[PDB]
């Protein structure tokens, strides 16, 4: 199982968006995040393996903590258009993901 604390969020075209995730199965390695755009299908977007403890790709960054199995993806300059549902997935099986419940975010602009 997987849990995402954030659930439903709104931010000012600016600030940092932090979506939290968590899991328990110590069998789990490698955790990718998917982002669903309103009315469209989910697509991957910044994944990490317990091997390291951080990963960046633009403003998108994942911070991972070993036991106390917490994980959290940070969107910088949270811009409108980044508003999607953002799903946290975890695994350890060579393609096949056990999905979390996702945290829908929306960035109010102006």
């Amino acid at each position: 199982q997987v849990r995402q604390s954030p659930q439903s969020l709104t931010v000012w075209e600016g600030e940092t968006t932090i979506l939290n995730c968590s899991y328990e199965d110590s069998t789990f390695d490698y955790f990718p995040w998917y982002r669903q755009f309103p009315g469209k299908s989910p697509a991957l977007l910044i994944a990490i393996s317990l091997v390291s403890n951080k990963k960046e790709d633009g403003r998108f960054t994942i911070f991972f903590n070993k036991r106390e199995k917490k994980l959290s993806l940070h969107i910088t300059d949270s811009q409108p258009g980044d508003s999607a549902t953002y799903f946290c997935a975890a695994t350890g099986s060579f393609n096949k993901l056990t999905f979390g419940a996702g945290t829908r975010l929306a960035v109010s602009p102006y």
Binding site: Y30, P32, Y34, K40, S41, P42, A43, L44, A47, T85, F87, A89, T91, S93, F94, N95, K96, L97, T98, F99, G100, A101, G102
Partner: protein, 112 residues
């Protein structure tokens, strides 16, 4: 490039109904989720190869058939307003667990 033939499907309770998938670009194993605002993605079966079918996290209430790579159908004999969400099909085939989701198929089980 995954394809979910019909985007809008409807059915009366207790009535067989199938959902088909197709995937240009051979990605050995496919899947079968259901979007339900409360719990995300949630998988219900999936196959490794052409002739295989394995239960998922939400098996039972459904049935899956992998007639041959490319196409993968999820069957619902005896519908139920309980299975009235969005069915998403997805493929993949490498480590990293990169799955490719189709566009989606909305199912509304009339009944009650």
């Amino acid at each position: 490039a995954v394809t979910q033939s019909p985007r809008n499907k409807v059915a009366v309770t207790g009535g067989k109904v199938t959902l088909s998938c197709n995937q240009t670009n051979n990605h050995n194993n496919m899947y079968w989720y259901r979007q339900d605002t409360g719990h995300g993605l949630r998988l219900i079966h999936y196959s490794y190869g052409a002739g295989s079918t394995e239960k998922g996290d939400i098996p039972d209430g459904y049935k899956a058939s992998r007639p041959s790579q490319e196409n993968f159908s999820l069957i619902l004999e005896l519908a139920t307003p309980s299975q009235t969400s969005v069915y998403f099909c997805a493929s993949g085939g490498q480590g990293r667990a990169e799955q490719f989701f189709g566009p989606g198929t909305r199912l509304t089980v009339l009944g009650s």
